[PDB]
């Protein structure tokens, strides 16, 4: 077919792993499978302009082709996708991420109608990284203004005694920085590419089996532009989407995680695992957190409880 260019925006600067390591490869294989003729330009760090919150905005009206984001940048957007950040709901990022991604074909279909979907996939489960204060349990969190990617996160910091603060991972650095947060939660793998290891030295996570929170990322093509793809460059994007891809990428977020930590250790860092009593206190904020939810969602015109159970179910279909 045509040779056709497709534009790629999004927040995070070049070396973040969700550009060199996921969108990067991404689009080599489909320059190889379109026989050259499928070109992706990768634009980072919002080099076309605007706004993180603005790159959905972007990926819907045509401004740019596909789009890399956190789907709670734009708080309420997603309302389906919330179910999934609600407090121990994630297992590996492989097993959440095949379950986010059926979410999505199924029962959440209606949150992303207006776009070609390529993969819905999350983080593994993030810790919790503050500058210096260990947090052993939820009442280290009193006085702490802590950083959260979107308002589910936030009300969870909210309910475990933190002081809470929403922004897009870029600015984060930048407000530890300052002094107008002490910590935040983030997986592991984000940190190196904003040194937020080198501005952080506690962190904290839990064990067992589900992870302390995760937050989808929608990996998103222009409907029309998709669309208007020849059927073989239909193919090949298709060869390249759906839930292989979501399972491929919890699989590359879940490895993300171990070069990231070793780095956060060389730069002098204490990891703290919550088990027991400590651990069990934050589980039981949980489930109140859960009941919230499921409130909100139901005066949004959701069924809240099934899709809390749906999320629990399909985790468990796929943490195997």
């Given amino acids: 077919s045509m040779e056709v260019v497709l534009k790629f925006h999004s927040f995070p600067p070049m070396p973040a792993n969700s550009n060199a390591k996921f969108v990067k490869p991404w689009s080599e294989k489909v320059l190889a499978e379109s026989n050259g003729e499928i070109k992706v330009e990768i634009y980072p760090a919002m080099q076309l302009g605007g706004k993180p919150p603005q790159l959905v905005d ?134 190196p590419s904003f040194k937020l290891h080198e501005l952080t030295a506690a962190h904290t996570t839990v064990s067992g089996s589900r992870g302390l929170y995760t937050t989808p990322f929608l990996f998103l093509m222009n409907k029309a532009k998709y669309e208007s793809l020849s059927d073989e460059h239909k193919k090949v994007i298709d060869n390249n989407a759906g839930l292989a891809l979501a399972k491929l990428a919890g699989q590359l977020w879940d490895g993300f995680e171990v070069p990231a930590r070793k780095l956060a250790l060389d730069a002098g860092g204490t990891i703290h695992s919550l088990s027991g009593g400590p651990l069990a206190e934050m589980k039981a904020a949980g489930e109140g957190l859960e009941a919230d939810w499921i409130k909100s969602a139901n005066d949004r015109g959701l069924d809240g409880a099934m899709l809390v159970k749906t999320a629990k179910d399909l985790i468990s279909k796929y943490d195997k």
């Fill in 58 to 191: 972007q990926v819907r009206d045509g401004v740019v082709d596909i789009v890399w984001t956190v789907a709670g940048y734009t708080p309420g957007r997603f309302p389906h996708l919330e179910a999934f950040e609600l407090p121990f709901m994630p297992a590996s990022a492989e097993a959440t991420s095949q379950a986010l991604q059926e979410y999505v074909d199924t029962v959440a279909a209606s949150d992303l109608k207006d776009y070609k979907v390529l993969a819905v996939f999350c983080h593994a489960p993030g810790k919790i990284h503050t500058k210096e204060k260990v947090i052993a349990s939820a009442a280290d969190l009193n006085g702490m203004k802590m950083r959260g990617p979107t308002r589910v996160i936030t009300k969870m910091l909210e309910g475990l005694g933190a002081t809470p603060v929403g922004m897009p991972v870029p600015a984060v650095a930048g407000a530890l920085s300052k002094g107008v947060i002490d910590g935040m939660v983030v997986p592991w793998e984000i940190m």
